[PDB]
């Protein structure tokens, strides 16, 4: 009815969602991605989980490799490419004055082929030794500069853990404004996970969103500055939807499970549990997930 899973109101002591529809006799058996929680077991019976999952992190589209072309003019700067062809024509104009008009055109084409790097005139000899040394430091400094740009590229470690989001602020992060996910961070006592909550409590702009869709888009439109925290099942599912610009990063934070829920003392209870276990050992449960997540995935 109210399009909700199920949780108890703090005021009216009123159970809403499907858990509501089960305890007030409106339904006989719920089959949905309902998280088996503590306070739920106290009002409704669960079976074994038919799908194990956890709270995880979502990232924005990373640019695909690569520009390439403008990673050659970058190591050796634009203003140093110029100077090495200003003294290049400054060496071949000093070597040209050591050697009537066309006799200086075949000699400016003979000094510009010796300037293009590869007798004992002590003049241009201390040109060929100090220009060669000049182009030795340059090639040694281009080789070293490039080895630090491919090193820095392999060092930029993607946001691996929830410890990483806590270790900075440049990337905003929040969860659903209601539901289990927000209730974890709130209730939790764990050192890291609390430090994340104290952040999200005092967040400007607000890091909380209203829907699962509103968060997917916020991730999808913040140029990689917002991370949405949600359950793994939905996270690895949005990784398969066009335009395929959301990625599941790092292991989950906890270990929940989705199970079939029946009212307390339902005759349908016990067989359903056997069914889930039967379906699990047969592989129908693994096959069904690969069906809906990956076999119809656009990636």
């Amino acid at each position: 009815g109210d399009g909700k899973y199920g949780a108890r109101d703090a005021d009216t002591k009123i159970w809403n969602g499907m858990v509501g529809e089960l305890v007030y006799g409106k339904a006989d058996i719920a089959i949905a991605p309902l998280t088996i929680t503590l306070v739920r077991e106290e009002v409704i019976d669960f079976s074994k989980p038919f799908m194990s999952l956890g709270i995880s992190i979502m990232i924005k589209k990373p640019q695909k490799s690569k520009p390439g072309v403008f990673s050659f003019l970058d190591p050796l700067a634009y203003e140093i490419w110029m100077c090495i062809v200003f003294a290049y024509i400054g060496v071949s104009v000093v070597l040209f004055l050591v050697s009537t008009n066309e006799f200086g055109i075949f000699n400016s084409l003979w000094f510009s082929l010796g300037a293009f790097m590869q007798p004992r005139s002590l003049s241009g000899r201390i040109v060929g030794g100090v220009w060669w040394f000049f182009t030795l430091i340059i090639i040694s400094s281009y080789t070293a500069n490039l080895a630090a740009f491919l090193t820095v590229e392999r060092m930029v470690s993607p946001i691996e853990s929830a410890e990483d989001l806590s270790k900075q602020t440049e990337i905003a992060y929040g969860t659903l404004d209601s539901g289990s996910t927000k209730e974890f961070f709130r209730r939790s006592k764990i050192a890291v996970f609390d430090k994340m909550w104290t952040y999200m409590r005092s967040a400007e702009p607000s890091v909380f969103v209203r829907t699962t869709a509103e968060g997917v888009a916020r991730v999808r439109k913040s140029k990689g500055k917002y991370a949405y925290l949600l359950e793994s099942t939905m996270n690895e599912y949005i990784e398969q939807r066009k335009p395929c610009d959301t990625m599941k990063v790092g292991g989950n934070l906890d270990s929940k499970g989705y199970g079939i829920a029946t009212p307390k003392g339902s005759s349908l209870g016990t067989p359903v549990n056997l069914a889930v276990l039967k379906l699990s050992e047969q592989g129908v449960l693994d096959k069904l997930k690969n069906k809906w997540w990956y076999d119809k995935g656009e990636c």
Partner: protein, 33 residues
């Protein structure tokens, strides 16, 4: 990390230093010969 013309600068002076020393030994070879 970003490279600078700094270190590169002090090698442009040895070049034009070796160029200016070259035009110094060039002008003495056409005097002797």
């Amino acid at each position: 990390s970003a490279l600078s013309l700094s270190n590169v600068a002090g090698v442009f002076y040895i070049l034009v230093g070796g160029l200016g020393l070259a035009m110094l030994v060039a002008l003495i070879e056409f005097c002797y010969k």
